[PDB]
């Protein structure tokens, strides 16, 4: 073991794709990553937001993540946390940084649809005509992948579709108006914003990365 | 698939067999491209992912590769996501957080 990943503040991994049934097993979502980071001295905490839908609102994932962060802070004696979120988890992490800036040291987003997902939009459109969405091979293959990533459920079809509602262009548009961040570039520019942000009297380090395996071709 | 290609995989890539999310995410990513998303990971476009200091958007990854998924299977051209996250945690450490 060593101290390569031994940050000053605890690291909270925040999943995005989750089921609608609270307390599902999320230990393998960040596959092999918790043990790797622990071997390098990190204090890793994996949030479980399964059972909560949207990020904002009194019973959204944001208030749940905030409560989890306060629990980690009360237990450790630490004053702040580093939030690393994947997919929706990046939006959930932004909620906590906005409503409780003094508890956050950094926000890192991985594959987060800050401006929405065109696949979520496509599914919204298809559901107006086929409410199950299973007539579409592309939707059915996604549903099956979702099912394999999360713990067993009798209702994978429903949960996989539910997972995309928060990620539409329209939903995320409202979210960004409600929860602005200097980390976001101007709408329609396809550019990032600032590397840091001052929210209360707190400075936040802001980061992100994404994958571009799927490229457009003429054929 | 029409209108898109998956750069994470090489010729006769076993990831197309053992991890069903590889081809599924190419199909969802093609739907996104027909909706003006541009390059993407299957669920999220490069443009939509941009926030704060962008370390990179050039990884040859689909959405599940980012979390070393399914069960750590990734195409032949995909970078190691475990090492990428590890490097970032050290980055945070060296930034004083
Ligand atoms: Ca994979």
Residue B39 contacts A where some CB pair is shorter than 8 Å: yes
Residue A213 three-state SS: coil
Residue A146 contacts B where some CB pair is shorter than 8 Å: no
Name all domains of chain A by residue range, CATH numbers in brackets: 1-219 (3.40.50.1820)
Q: In whole angstroms, what is the distance from residue B94 CA to residue B90 CA?
A: 6
Which member of B20, B65, B85 has the closest CB to residue A211? B65
- Provide the domain count of chain B: 1
Phi-psi region of A188 (alpha: psi -120 to 50; beta: other; left: phi over 0): left
Measured CA to CA in angstroms, residue B64 lies from A17, A148, B24, B83 at distances of 10, 11, 11, 15
A4: number of Cβ within 10 Å: 15
Q: Resolution, in Å, please?
A: 1.7
Tell me the CA–centroid distance for residue B41 and ligand 1, in Å. Answer: 11
Query: Which residues of A are catalytic, by number?
Result: 87
For Cα atoms A37, A42, A43, give the angle at the middle one, nearest 5 degrees: 115
Domain housing B71: 1-97
Method: X-ray
Q: Which residues of A are annotated as a binding site?
A: 17, 88
Residue B59 three-state SS: strand
Spell out the SS3 assignment of A19-59.
CCCCCCCCCCCCCCHHHHHHHCCCCEEECCCCCCCCCCCCC
Specify the DSSP element, H or E, that contains A196. strand A196-198
Residue B19 contacts A where some CB pair is shorter than 8 Å: no
Beta-carbon separation of B57 and A115 below 8 A: no
Q: In whole angstroms, what is the distance from residue A135 CA to residue A155 CA?
A: 17
Q: In whole angstroms, what is the distance from residue A195 CA to residue B50 CA?
A: 11
Query: Which residues of B are catalytic, by number?
Result: 41, 63
Tokens of A12: 């909270």
Q: Which of B89, B91, B95 to mutate to test the interface with A (most CBs of A within 10 A)?
A: B89
For Cα atoms B53, A34, B74, give the angle at the middle one, nearest 5 degrees: 75
Ion ligand 1 nearby residues (CB, 5 A) = B 19, 65, 73-74
Task: Please give the radius of gyration of chain B, using alpha carbons only, rounded to the nearest integer.
Answer: 14
Tell me the CA–centroid distance for residue B21 and ligand 1, in Å. Answer: 6
Residue A29 contacts B where some CB pair is shorter than 8 Å: yes
Which member of B4, B28, B57 has the closest CB to residue A209? B57
B53 annotated binding-site participant: no
Residue B16 contacts A where some CB pair is shorter than 8 Å: no
Longest alpha-carbon distance in chain B: 47
Which member of A80, A191, A193 has the closest CB to residue B52? A193
B2 annotated binding-site participant: no
Helices of type H across chain B: 15-18, 21-34, 46-49, 81-94
Q: Which of A55, A146, A147, A141 is nearest to A96 (CA)?
A: A55
């Amino acid at each position: 073991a060593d101290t390569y990943a031994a940050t000053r503040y605890p690291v909270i991994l925040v999943h995005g794709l989750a089921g609608t049934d609270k307390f599902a097993n999320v230990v393998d979502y960040w596959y092999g990553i918790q043990s790797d980071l622990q071997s390098h001295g990190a204090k890793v905490y994996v949030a479980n937001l399964s059972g909560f839908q949207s990020d904002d609102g009194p019973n959204g994932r944001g208030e749940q993540l905030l409560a989890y962060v306060k629990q980690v802070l009360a237990a450790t004696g630490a004053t702040k946390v580093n939030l690393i979120g994947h997919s929706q988890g990046g939006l959930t992490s932004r909620y906590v940084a906005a409503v409780a800036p003094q508890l956050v040291a950094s926000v890192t987003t991985i594959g987060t649809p800050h401006r929405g997902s065109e696949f979520a939009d496509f599914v919204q459109d298809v559901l107006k005509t086929d409410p199950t969405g299973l007539s579409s091979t592309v939707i059915a293959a996604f549903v099956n992948v979702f099912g394999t990533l999360v713990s067993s459920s009798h209702n994978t079809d429903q949960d996989a579709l539910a997972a995309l509602r928060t990620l539409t262009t329209a939903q995320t548009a409202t979210y960004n108006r409600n929860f602005p961040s200097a980390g976001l570039g101007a709408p329609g520019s396809c550019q990032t914003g600032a590397a840091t942000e001052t929210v209360g009297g707190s400075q936040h380090l802001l980061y992100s990365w994404g994958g571009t395996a799927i490229q457009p071709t003429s054929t | 698939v029409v209108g898109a290609t998956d750069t994470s995989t090489g010729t006769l890539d076993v990831a197309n067999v053992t991890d069903p999310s590889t081809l599924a995410l190419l199909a969802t990513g093609a739907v996104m491209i027909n909706r003006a998303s541009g390059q993407n990971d299957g669920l999220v476009s490069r443009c939509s992912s941009l926030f704060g200091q962008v370390i990179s958007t050039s990884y040859h990854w689909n959405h599940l590769d980012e979390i070393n998924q399914l069960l750590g299977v990734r195409g032949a051209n995909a970078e190691d996501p475990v090492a990428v996250i590890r490097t970032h945690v050290n980055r945070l450490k060296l930034q004083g957080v």
